[PDB]
CSV table of C-alpha atoms and ligand atoms in Angstrom, one decimal:
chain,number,residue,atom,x,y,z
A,24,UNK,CA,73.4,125.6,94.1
A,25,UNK,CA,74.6,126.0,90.4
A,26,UNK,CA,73.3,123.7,88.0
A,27,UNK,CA,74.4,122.7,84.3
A,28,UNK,CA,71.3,122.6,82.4
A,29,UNK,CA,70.5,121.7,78.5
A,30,UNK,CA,68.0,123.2,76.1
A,31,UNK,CA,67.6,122.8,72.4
A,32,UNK,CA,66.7,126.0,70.9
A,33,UNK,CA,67.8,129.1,69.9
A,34,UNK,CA,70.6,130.6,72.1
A,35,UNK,CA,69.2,134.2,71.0
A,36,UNK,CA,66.3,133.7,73.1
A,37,UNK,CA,68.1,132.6,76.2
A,38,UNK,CA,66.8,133.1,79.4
A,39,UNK,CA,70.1,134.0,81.2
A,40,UNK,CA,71.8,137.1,82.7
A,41,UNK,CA,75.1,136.5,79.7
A,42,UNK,CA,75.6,135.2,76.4
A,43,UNK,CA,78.8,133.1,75.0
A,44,UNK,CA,79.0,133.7,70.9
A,45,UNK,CA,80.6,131.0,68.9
A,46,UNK,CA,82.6,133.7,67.1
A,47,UNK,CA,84.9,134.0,64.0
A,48,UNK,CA,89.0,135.7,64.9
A,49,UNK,CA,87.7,138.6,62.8
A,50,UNK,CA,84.6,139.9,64.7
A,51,UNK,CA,82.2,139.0,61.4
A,52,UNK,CA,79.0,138.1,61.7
A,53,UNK,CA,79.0,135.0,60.2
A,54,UNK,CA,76.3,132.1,59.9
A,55,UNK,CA,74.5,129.6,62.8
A,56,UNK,CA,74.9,130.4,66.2
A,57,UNK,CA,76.7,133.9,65.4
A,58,UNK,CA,74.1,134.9,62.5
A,59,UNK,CA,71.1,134.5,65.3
A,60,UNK,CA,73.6,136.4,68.2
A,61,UNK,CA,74.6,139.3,65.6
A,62,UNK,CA,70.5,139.7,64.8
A,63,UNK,CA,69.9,140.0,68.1
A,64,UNK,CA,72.8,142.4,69.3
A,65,UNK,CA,74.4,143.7,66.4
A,66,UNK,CA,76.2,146.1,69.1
A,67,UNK,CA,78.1,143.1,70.7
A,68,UNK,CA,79.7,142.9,66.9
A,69,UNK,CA,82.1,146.2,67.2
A,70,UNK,CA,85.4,145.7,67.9
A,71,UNK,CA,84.3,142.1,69.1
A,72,UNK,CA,87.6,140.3,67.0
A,73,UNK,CA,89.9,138.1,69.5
A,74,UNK,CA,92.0,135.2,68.6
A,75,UNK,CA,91.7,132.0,68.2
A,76,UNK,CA,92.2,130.2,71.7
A,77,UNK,CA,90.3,133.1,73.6
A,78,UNK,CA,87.3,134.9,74.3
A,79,UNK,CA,86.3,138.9,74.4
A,80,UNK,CA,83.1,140.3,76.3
A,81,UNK,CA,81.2,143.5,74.4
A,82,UNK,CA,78.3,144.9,76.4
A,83,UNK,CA,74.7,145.3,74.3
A,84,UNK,CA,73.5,147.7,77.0
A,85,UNK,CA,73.6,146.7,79.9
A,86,UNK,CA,73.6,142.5,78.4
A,87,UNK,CA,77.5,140.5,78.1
A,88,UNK,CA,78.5,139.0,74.8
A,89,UNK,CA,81.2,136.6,75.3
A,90,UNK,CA,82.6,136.0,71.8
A,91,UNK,CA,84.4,132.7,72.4
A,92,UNK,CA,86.8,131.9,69.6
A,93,UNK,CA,86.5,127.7,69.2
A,94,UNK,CA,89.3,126.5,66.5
A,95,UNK,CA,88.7,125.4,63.1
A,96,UNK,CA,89.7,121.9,63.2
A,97,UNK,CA,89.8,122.0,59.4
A,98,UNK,CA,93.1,124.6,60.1
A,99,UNK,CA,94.5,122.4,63.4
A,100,UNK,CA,96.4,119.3,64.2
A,101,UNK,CA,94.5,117.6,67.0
A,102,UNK,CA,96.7,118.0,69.5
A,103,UNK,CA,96.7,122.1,69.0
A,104,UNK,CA,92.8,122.5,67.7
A,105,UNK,CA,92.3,120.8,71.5
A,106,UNK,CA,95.1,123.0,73.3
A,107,UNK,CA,92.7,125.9,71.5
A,108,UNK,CA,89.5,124.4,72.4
A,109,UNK,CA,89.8,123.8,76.1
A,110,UNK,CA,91.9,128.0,76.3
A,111,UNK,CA,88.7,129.3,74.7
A,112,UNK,CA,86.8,127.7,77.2
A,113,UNK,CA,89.2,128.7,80.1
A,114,UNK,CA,88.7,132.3,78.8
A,115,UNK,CA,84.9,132.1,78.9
A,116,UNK,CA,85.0,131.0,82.4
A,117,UNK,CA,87.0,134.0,83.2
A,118,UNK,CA,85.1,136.6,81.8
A,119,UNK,CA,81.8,135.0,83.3
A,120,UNK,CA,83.4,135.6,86.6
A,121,UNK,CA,84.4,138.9,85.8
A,122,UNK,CA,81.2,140.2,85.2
A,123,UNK,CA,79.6,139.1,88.5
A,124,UNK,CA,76.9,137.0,86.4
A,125,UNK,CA,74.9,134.0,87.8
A,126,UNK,CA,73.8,132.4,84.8
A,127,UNK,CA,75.3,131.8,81.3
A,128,UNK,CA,74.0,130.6,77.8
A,129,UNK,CA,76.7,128.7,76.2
A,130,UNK,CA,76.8,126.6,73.0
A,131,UNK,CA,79.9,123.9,71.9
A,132,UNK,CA,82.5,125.3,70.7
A,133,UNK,CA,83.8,123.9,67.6
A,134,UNK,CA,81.0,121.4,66.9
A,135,UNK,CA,79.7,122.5,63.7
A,136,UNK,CA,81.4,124.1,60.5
A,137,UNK,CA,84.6,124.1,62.6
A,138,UNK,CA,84.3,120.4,63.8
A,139,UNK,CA,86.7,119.3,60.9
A,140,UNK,CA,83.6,117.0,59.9
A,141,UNK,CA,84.3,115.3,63.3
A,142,UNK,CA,81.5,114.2,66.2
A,143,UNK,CA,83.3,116.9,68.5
A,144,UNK,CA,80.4,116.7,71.8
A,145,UNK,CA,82.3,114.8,74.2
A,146,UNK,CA,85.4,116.3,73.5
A,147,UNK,CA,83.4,119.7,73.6
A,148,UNK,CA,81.7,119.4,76.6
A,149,UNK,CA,84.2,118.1,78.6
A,150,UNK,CA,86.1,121.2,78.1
A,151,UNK,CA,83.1,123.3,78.9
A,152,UNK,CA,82.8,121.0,82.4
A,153,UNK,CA,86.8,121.5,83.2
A,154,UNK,CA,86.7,125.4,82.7
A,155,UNK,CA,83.0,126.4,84.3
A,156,UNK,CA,83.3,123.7,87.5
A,157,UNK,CA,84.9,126.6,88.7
A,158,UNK,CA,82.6,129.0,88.6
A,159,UNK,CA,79.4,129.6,90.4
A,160,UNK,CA,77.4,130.2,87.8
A,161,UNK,CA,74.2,128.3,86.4
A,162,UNK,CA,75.3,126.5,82.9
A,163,UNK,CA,72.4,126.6,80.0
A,164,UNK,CA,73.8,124.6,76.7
A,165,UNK,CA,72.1,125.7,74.0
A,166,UNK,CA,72.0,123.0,71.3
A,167,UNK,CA,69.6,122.7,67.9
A,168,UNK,CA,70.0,118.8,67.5
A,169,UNK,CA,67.4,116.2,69.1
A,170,UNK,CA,70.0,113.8,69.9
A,171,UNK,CA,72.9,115.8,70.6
A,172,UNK,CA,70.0,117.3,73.4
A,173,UNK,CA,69.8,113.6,74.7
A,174,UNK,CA,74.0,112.9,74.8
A,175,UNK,CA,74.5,116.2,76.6
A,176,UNK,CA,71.7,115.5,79.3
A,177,UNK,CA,72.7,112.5,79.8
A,178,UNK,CA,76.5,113.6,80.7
A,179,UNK,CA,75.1,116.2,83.0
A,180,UNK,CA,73.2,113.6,84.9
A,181,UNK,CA,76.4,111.2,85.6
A,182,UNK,CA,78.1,113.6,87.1
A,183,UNK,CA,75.6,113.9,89.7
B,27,TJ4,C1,82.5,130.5,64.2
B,27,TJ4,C2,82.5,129.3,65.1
B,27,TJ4,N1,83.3,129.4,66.3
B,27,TJ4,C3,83.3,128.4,67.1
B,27,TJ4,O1,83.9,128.5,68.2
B,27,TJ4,N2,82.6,127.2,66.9
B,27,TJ4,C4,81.9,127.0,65.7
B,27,TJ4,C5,81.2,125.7,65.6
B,27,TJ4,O2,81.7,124.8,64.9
B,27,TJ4,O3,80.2,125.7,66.1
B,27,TJ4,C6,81.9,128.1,64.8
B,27,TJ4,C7,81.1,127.9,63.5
């Protein structure tokens, strides 16, 4: 039975069958979560740019990438950053059903040096639940922060 499951470490050392990249619209590299993916498959970076809003899978071998494109809330009102937020994680959801895989490493989109300088994890994860409770894949969030860690476990566990 599918689970949604926390861990606070690097997502480049996952332990699932897929990856979702919190990606830049211009397929860079870039710094935190994306700096650690593009270290660890550099191939997953060609031709990897998608827009804002949606999500792109490039195989590294035979292992998915899902670049996910989470709005800059810095750019967005926050009625469209949160249009963008909840479509990015709509297109993750499809693209993890596409590939046939049963597990996925995913981080928040749009928590970090896109959050606007906001406390983005409900509004976040939320989105992450509405999109992926439709799949039947097994849900790792990857997060770095100790608290953050304790808020996201604790929201998995209510809904149980
Ligand atoms: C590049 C990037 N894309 C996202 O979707 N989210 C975030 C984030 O704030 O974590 C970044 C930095």
């Amino acid at each position: 039975a599918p689970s949604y499951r926390v861990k606070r470490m690097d997502i480049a050392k996952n332990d699932e069958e897929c990856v979702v990249n919190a990606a830049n619209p211009r397929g860079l590299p870039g710094d935190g979560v994306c700096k650690a993916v593009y270290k660890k498959w550099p191939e997953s970076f060609k031709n990897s740019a998608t827009p804002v809003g949606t999500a792109k899978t490039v195989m590294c071998g035979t292992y998915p990438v899902i670049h996910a494109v989470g709005p800059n809330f810095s750019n967005y009102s926050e009625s469209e950053g949160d249009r963008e937020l909840a479509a990015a994680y709509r297109e993750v959801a499809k693209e993890v059903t596409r590939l046939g895989v049963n597990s996925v490493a995913i981080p928040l989109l749009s928590t970090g040096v896109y959050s606007g300088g906001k406390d983005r994890l409900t509004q976040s994860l939320n989105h992450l639940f509405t999109a992926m409770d439709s799949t039947d894949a097994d849900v790792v969030i990857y997060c770095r922060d100790k608290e953050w860690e304790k808020k996201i476990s604790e929201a998995i566990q209510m809904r149980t």
